[PDB]
Amino acid sequence: QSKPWNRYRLPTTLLPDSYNVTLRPYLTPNADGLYIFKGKSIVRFLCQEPTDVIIIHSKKLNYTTQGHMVVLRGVGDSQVPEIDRTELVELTEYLVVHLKGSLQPGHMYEMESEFQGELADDLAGFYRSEYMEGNVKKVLATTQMQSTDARKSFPCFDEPAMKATFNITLIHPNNLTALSNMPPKGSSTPLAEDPNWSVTEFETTPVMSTYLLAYIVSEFQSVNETAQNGVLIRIWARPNAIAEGHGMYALNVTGPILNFFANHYNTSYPLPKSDQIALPDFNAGAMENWGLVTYRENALLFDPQSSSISNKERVVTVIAHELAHQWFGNLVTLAWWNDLWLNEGFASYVEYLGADHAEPTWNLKDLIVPGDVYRVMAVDALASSHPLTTPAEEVNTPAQISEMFDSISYSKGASVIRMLSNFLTEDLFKEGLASYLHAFAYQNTTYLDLWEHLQKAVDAQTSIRLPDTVRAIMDRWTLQMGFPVITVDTKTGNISQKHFLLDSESNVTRSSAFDYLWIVPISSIKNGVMQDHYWLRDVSQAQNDLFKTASDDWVLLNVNVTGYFQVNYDEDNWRMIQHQLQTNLSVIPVINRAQVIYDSFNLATAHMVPVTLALDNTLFLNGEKEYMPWQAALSSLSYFSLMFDRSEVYGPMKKYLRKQVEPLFQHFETLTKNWTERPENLMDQYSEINAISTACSNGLPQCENLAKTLFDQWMSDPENNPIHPNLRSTIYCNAIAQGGQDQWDFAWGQLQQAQLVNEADKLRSALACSNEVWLLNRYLGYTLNPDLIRKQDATSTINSIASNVIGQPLAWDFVQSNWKKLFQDYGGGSFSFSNLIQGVTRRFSSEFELQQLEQFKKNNMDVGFGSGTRALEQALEKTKANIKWVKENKEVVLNWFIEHSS
Ligand SMILES: *[C@@H]1O[C@H](CO)[C@@H](O[C@@H]2O[C@H](CO)[C@@H](O[C@@H]3O[C@H](CO)[C@@H](O)[C@H](O)[C@H]3NC(C)=O)[C@H](O)[C@H]2NC(C)=O)[C@H](O)[C@H]1NC(C)=O
Ligand SMILES: *[C@@H]1O[C@H](CO)[C@@H](O[C@@H]2O[C@H](CO)[C@@H](O[C@@H]3O[C@H](CO)[C@@H](O)[C@H](O)[C@H]3NC(C)=O)[C@H](O)[C@H]2NC(C)=O)[C@H](O)[C@H]1NC(C)=O
Ligand SMILES: *[C@@H]1O[C@H](CO)[C@@H](O[C@@H]2O[C@H](CO)[C@@H](O[C@@H]3O[C@H](CO)[C@@H](O)[C@H](O)[C@H]3NC(C)=O)[C@H](O)[C@H]2NC(C)=O)[C@H](O)[C@H]1NC(C)=O
Ligand SMILES: *[C@@H]1O[C@H](CO)[C@@H](O[C@@H]2O[C@H](CO)[C@@H](O)[C@H](O)[C@H]2NC(C)=O)[C@H](O)[C@H]1NC(C)=O
Ligand SMILES: *[C@@H]1O[C@H](CO)[C@@H](O[C@@H]2O[C@H](CO)[C@@H](O)[C@H](O)[C@H]2NC(C)=O)[C@H](O)[C@H]1NC(C)=O
Ligand SMILES: *[C@@H]1O[C@H](CO)[C@@H](O[C@@H]2O[C@H](CO)[C@@H](O)[C@H](O)[C@H]2NC(C)=O)[C@H](O)[C@H]1NC(C)=O
Ligand SMILES: *[C@@H]1O[C@H](CO)[C@@H](O[C@@H]2O[C@H](CO)[C@@H](O)[C@H](O)[C@H]2NC(C)=O)[C@H](O)[C@H]1NC(C)=O
Ligand SMILES: *[C@@H]1O[C@H](CO)[C@@H](O[C@@H]2O[C@H](CO)[C@@H](O)[C@H](O)[C@H]2NC(C)=O)[C@H](O)[C@H]1NC(C)=O
Ligand SMILES: *[C@@H]1O[C@H](CO)[C@@H](O[C@@H]2O[C@H](CO)[C@@H](O)[C@H](O)[C@H]2NC(C)=O)[C@H](O)[C@H]1NC(C)=O
Ligand SMILES: *[C@@H]1O[C@H](CO)[C@@H](O)[C@H](O)[C@H]1NC(C)=O
Ligand SMILES: *[C@@H]1O[C@H](CO)[C@@H](O)[C@H](O)[C@H]1NC(C)=O
Ligand SMILES: [Zn+2]
Numbered sequence: 001q002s003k004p005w006n007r008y009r010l011p012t013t014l015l016p017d018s019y020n021v022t023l024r025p026y027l028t029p030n031a032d033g034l035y036i037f038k039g040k041s042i043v044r045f046l047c048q049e050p051t052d053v054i055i056i057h058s059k060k061l062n063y064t065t066q067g068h069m070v071v072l073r074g075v076g077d078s079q080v081p082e083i084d085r086t087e088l089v090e091l092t093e094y095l096v097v098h099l100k101g102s103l104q105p106g107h108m109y110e111m112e113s114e115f116q117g118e119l120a121d122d123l124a125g126f127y128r129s130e131y132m133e134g135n136v137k138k139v140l141a142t143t144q145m146q147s148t149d150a151r152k153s154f155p156c157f158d159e160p161a162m163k164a165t166f167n168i169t170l171i172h173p174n175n176l177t178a179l180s181n182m183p184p185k186g187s188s189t190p191l192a193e194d195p196n197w198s199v200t201e202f203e204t205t206p207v208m209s210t211y212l213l214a215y216i217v218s219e220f221q222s223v224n225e226t227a228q229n230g231v232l233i234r235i236w237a238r239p240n241a242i243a244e245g246h247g248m249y250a251l252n253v254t255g256p257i258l259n260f261f262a263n264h265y266n267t268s269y270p271l272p273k274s275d276q277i278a279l280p281d282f283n284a285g286a287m288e289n290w291g292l293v294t295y296r297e298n299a300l301l302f303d304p305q306s307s308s309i310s311n312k313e314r315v316v317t318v319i320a321h322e323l324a325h326q327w328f329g330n331l332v333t334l335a336w337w338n339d340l341w342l343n344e345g346f347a348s349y350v351e352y353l354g355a356d357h358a359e360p361t362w363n364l365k366d367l368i369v370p371g372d373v374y375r376v377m378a379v380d381a382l383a384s385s386h387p388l389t390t391p392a393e394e395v396n397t398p399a400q401i402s403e404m405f406d407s408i409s410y411s412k413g414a415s416v417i418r419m420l421s422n423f424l425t426e427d428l429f430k431e432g433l434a435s436y437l438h439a440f441a442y443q444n445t446t447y448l449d450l451w452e453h454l455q456k457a458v459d460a461q462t463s464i465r466l467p468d469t470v471r472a473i474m475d476r477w478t479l480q481m482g483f484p485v486i487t488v489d490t491k492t493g494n495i496s497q498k499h500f501l502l503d504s505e506s507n508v509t510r511s512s513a514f515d516y517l518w519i520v521p522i523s524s525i526k527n528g529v530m531q532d533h534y535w536l537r538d539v540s541q542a543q544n545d546l547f548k549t550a551s552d553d554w555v556l557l558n559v560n561v562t563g564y565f566q567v568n569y570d571e572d573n574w575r576m577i578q579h580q581l582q583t584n585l586s587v588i589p590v591i592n593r594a595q596v597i598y599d600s601f602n603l604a605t606a607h608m609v610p611v612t613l614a615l616d617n618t619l620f621l622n623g624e625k626e627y628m629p630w631q632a633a634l635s636s637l638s639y640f641s642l643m644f645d646r647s648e649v650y651g652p653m654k655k656y657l658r659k660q661v662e663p664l665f666q667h668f669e670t671l672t673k674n675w676t677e678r679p680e681n682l683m684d685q686y687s688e689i690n691a692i693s694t695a696c697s698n699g700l701p702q703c704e705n706l707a708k709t710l711f712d713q714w715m716s717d718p719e720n721n722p723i724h725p726n727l728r729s730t731i732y733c734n735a736i737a738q739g740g741q742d743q744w745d746f747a748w749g750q751l752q753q754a755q756l757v758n759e760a761d762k763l764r765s766a767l768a769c770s771n772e773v774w775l776l777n778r779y780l781g782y783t784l785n786p787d788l789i790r791k792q793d794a795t796s797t798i799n800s801i802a803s804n805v806i807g808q809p810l811a812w813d814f815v816q817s818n819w820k821k822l823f824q825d826y827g828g829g830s831f832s833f834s835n836l837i838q839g840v841t842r843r844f845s846s847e848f849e850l851q852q853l854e855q856f857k858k859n860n861m862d863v864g865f866g867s868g869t870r871a872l873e874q875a876l877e878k879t880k881a882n883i884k885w886v887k888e889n890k891e892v893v894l895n896w897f898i899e900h901s902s
Pocket of ligand 2: 036037062116117118
């Protein structure tokens with residue numbers, strides 16, 4: 001029998017009731033340069049089963065408690081056993097209190113400790129964050145408990161189902177502000193031992209999970225709003241950011257998003273206030289701490305002067321995502337990390353709904369298709385994928401827990417939940433959702449609890465009928481990896497399903513309890529008219545007249561790609577769809593105009609259609625005004641550009657794209673009144689951004705003229721940038737491409753004085769668009785200079801240069817030559833060799849290039865590859881795949897482009 005302190009899961013013998021936690025960050029180092037925090041805690045817990053050991057989590061804490069590492073008392077008149085000894089077991093991250101007798105069922109105990117830890121700049125637990133305000137380096141104290149780091153700040157039963165109330169006190173410099181989950185109890189009071197410090201106590205939290213705790217000590221300031229129901233809403237940021245008004249957009253959307261969710265969830269916002277805080281360089285991006293949500297600055301702040309529309313979209317959706325969790329995830333919590341997909345998947349879906357409420361003219365809900373569905377299908381159409389569900393007993397270590405946070409959990413989770421809501425109808429979905437939240441409020445669940453409540457809503461009505469239970473359907477989508485391609489023969493109306501893999505030669509070795517068969521909801525449109533809904537049962541082949549067509553008719557499946565699958569047709573139906581798109585595109589919903597392109601290119605990759613059929617699906621684009629179908633083409637063709645931009649294929653390709661985009665460019669020229677005013681809504685603005693990008697990068701003279709004119713105008717009046725933030729990346733890039741050192745030196749000067757990260761990013765990237773070899777090489781020479789290029793931006797800048805067809809050999813030589821910088825950057829800055837390697841070798845598609853990559857690997861003697869070890873293996877395998885693809889596709893693609901480039 002293994003000792004419990006050697007098991008990764010806590011015993012169930014003791015359950016926490018409530019905690020007092022007092023934390024005191026020391027924001028001045030101890031002269032050795034060490035920053036620390038001190039703390040004191042008392043946990044009150046209940047004995048469920050007799051035990052003579054207390055096992056609680058503790059990570060990187062030193063104990064200074066008088067006596068043993070803890071003091072143990074009984075609550076009320078309970079007697080307590082004497083402590084035998086306390087020890088720390090580092091591997092399983094435990095503090096272990098061995099007792100001389102047993103705790104008694106039904107009795108409550110209080111365990112007190114005093115401790116300290118490093119306030120490291122490690123983004124884990126209670127940690128420090130350094131940033132600049134003018135000449136002064138500022139340091140604040142903040143938290144990131146997700147997933148298993150609460151125990152790094154104080155000893156606790158650090159599993160999500162072991163919920164408790166928390167009384168947080170911060171002891172901090174008297175001129176700084178202290179924030180936590182709950183409002184402060186009142187005004188701060190001086191610390192008696194040293195009145196330079198103050199003591200801020202916070203109101204008791206609701207019953208909640210340790211991973212959602214937060215506390216922050218900083219100089220930050222806020223913009224505020226009180227909602228009609230009295231809920232205080234604040235956006236916190238650096239005093240300069242607040243003064244510039246960069247917190248305003250977030251403040252604008254927050255109230256409406258909270259209102260949307262209270263109604264959507266049929267549940268009041270469960271806290272007295274909402275704080276959201278913008279942290280400089282918060283690498284986790286965003287964390288849904290209950291009542292105190294943390295964001296990286298560029299995720300929460302918005303500058304109308306320099307920020308593009310895509311920046312606005314990022315802000316409203318990231319906010320909606322975190323706010324979604326304040327009910328789903330925080331109020332009702334998944335019992336264990338193996339079900340992380342339900343929590344993050346749900347938030348990743350409803351972020352679009354919440355954002356749509358704040359910005360109802362934007363059609364934001366559409367963006368889940370490009371943003372999540374087709375994104376995750378790329379990795380879920382591999383033999384190396386994995387099911388959404390993982391047995392709980394396989395998820396034990398903090399590393400195993402962290403592995404839950406991936407593209408499948410977030411984006412496939414979002415995709416399958418959106419499919420579920422769609423086939424149930426939103427009204428029915430919302431009813432089950434409300435029932436689930438009301439039943440499990442302040443408690444924990446598994447995904448089976450949601451299915452059961454959804455089933456209850458299904459069973460309480462008669463309109464929506466399903467081919468099986470909610471659970472049996474969802475099991476097909478959650479217990480096995482991947483997704484089917486649905487193939488229709490419109491001559492007969494025969495319809496089939498099979499596990500879709502991009503590599504037709506791939507061997508799947510992960511077994512499925514269902515033999516990779518799904519129960520598939522199938523909406524369809526025929527001649528532009530919605531048909532009756534259909535369910536494909538767990539069969540390989542079926543037939544229905546819904547999918548049988550006449551010679552002059554067409555059918556199209558999966559309206560708005562609500563279903564998590566791709567669709568193939570017989571060539572005749574494809575041709576009819578193409579005809580419809582050529583003659584009157586308005587008849588096919590915009591999302592399906594994108595689907596036709598997305599799916600066919602994937603099908604070509606899989607050898608289920610010829611590559612020419614996929615290309616034929618781009619032919620209609622010359623008349624397409626809307627964002628998504630163009631985006632689908634551009635995403636699908638980026639690999640073609642990557643493979644062929646140094647070959648004889650490139651000329652006809654550019655010419656074809658010039659032909660396709662010219663009318664869209666012309667359209668926006670008129671609509672925008674000679675480019676003076678942006679289109680109204682988000683999607684049209686996105687379309688303009690892509691149109692100008694496509695036009696300019698493919699050498700459309702009218703676009704080249706625009707870019708030169710705007711940049712020249714800017715150079716003649718630097719303080720007044722005439723280029724709208726939406727277009728800056730293209731205009732900057734094309735203009736630097738056309739020009740020489742005058743444009744380059746001007747943009748470099750602008751970069752060096754850039755106050756805002758998003759503008760600096762645009763400049764760094766555009767500078768890589770120079771067509772002068774000497775300018776690119778001189779630029780490369782700058783990438784390793786911290787005075788000129790931030791370390792964190794080094795590999796990104798090299799990759800941008802590599803992306804330039806001219807910079808490709810320059811960057812590859814630069815990387816090979818300077819690879820002797822691994823023992824300079826691995827302990828001091830992680831650097832990410834993996835990204836660099838992938839970026840620089842991205843183009844490789846010849847045996848000769850493979851031979852070069854093998855030769856570079858032949859420095860195996862010491863130096864190594866660091867964190868990019870076996871990312872080099874991925875590059876070698878990718879090159880082999882590229883060689884095979886180019887050989888198979890070169891002639892066919894060349895001839896298609898020549899044929900269709902006029
Ligand atoms: C977790 O923290 C809580 C907040 O500090 C503690 O509750 C507080 O306990 C204090 C006593 O330890 C009380 O303060 C005063 O104590 C003096 C003792 O001499 C009494 O005269 C007073 O009655 C009392 N002051 C007032 C204004 O009543 C606090 O009253 C009390 N605060 C509360 C209940 O909100 C918890 O004790 C602590 N938990 C554990 C297990 O230690
Ligand atoms: C938690 O306790 C740890 C173990 O006691 C502390 O880590 C130790 O810090 C010591 C002092 O800072 C280091 O020992 C030596 O200290 C002398 C005098 O300060 C120096 O001359 C030496 O350079 C130093 N030794 C070395 C090899 O550098 C220990 O290195 C170190 N022990 C470890 C890490 O196992 C923590 O500081 C303490 N943390 C907090 C937040 O209180
Ligand atoms: C947070 O919400 C605010 C209220 O809805 C928005 O405030 C609006 O800002 C607009 C842009 O600054 C203003 O529109 C126009 O501004 C120009 C330039 O100064 C003026 O010429 C126009 O008179 C003005 N109105 C027009 C063209 O109709 C709005 O006036 C203003 N609305 C209100 C009620 O004050 C904020 O924009 C918003 N913050 C962010 C970052 O989006
Ligand atoms: C955290 O603070 C709360 C609020 O003061 C404490 O809740 C009280 O707990 C005591 C002892 O169990 C009860 O007599 C009171 O009825 C509670 N008050 C309320 C409003 O719930 C809680 O005990 C504190 N936590 C700890 C660990 O001391
Ligand atoms: C809070 O008080 C501290 C200590 O007086 C201030 O920190 C100093 O700030 C000045 C800049 O004006 C620096 O020159 C010093 O080096 C800082 N001293 C220390 C010990 O850090 C701080 O500026 C005050 N902050 C606010 C918001 O009032
Ligand atoms: C949650 O939903 C319920 C049920 O729809 C809401 O109660 C209804 O409110 C409307 C509004 O006038 C009434 O017409 C219905 O008669 C109510 N139905 C019932 C059964 O009470 C309720 O207001 C919602 N609650 C929250 C907190 O959002
Ligand atoms: C995890 O969640 C379950 C609910 O899904 C909790 O069990 C419930 O506890 C409440 C409140 O004490 C009872 O009213 C219910 O009867 C329980 N339902 C059950 C057992 O199905 C459970 O307590 C939570 N786990 C922890 C450690 O708090
Ligand atoms: C469409 O499905 C039908 C029926 O499932 C297929 O017809 C069957 O084909 C096999 C081939 O040997 C015959 O043995 C059966 O007798 C046929 N069943 C009939 C006619 O009812 C048909 O081949 C399919 N058509 C396709 C895939 O184009
Ligand atoms: C397919 O998606 C489109 C959006 O791309 C849906 O059209 C929207 O529908 C709602 C409700 O009918 C309207 O409020 C919006 O104004 C519509 N927007 C546009 C641009 O048309 C359409 O309803 C979806 N089709 C199906 C069958 O669900
Ligand atoms: C897959 O299995 C087949 C034999 O069934 C074999 O020919 C092939 O080499 C295997 N691997 C790949 C990557 O195709
Ligand atoms: C094309 O179809 C749209 C949408 O169904 C319709 O409104 C329009 O009349 C049609 N236009 C033409 C030119 O056929
Ligand atoms: Zn989330």
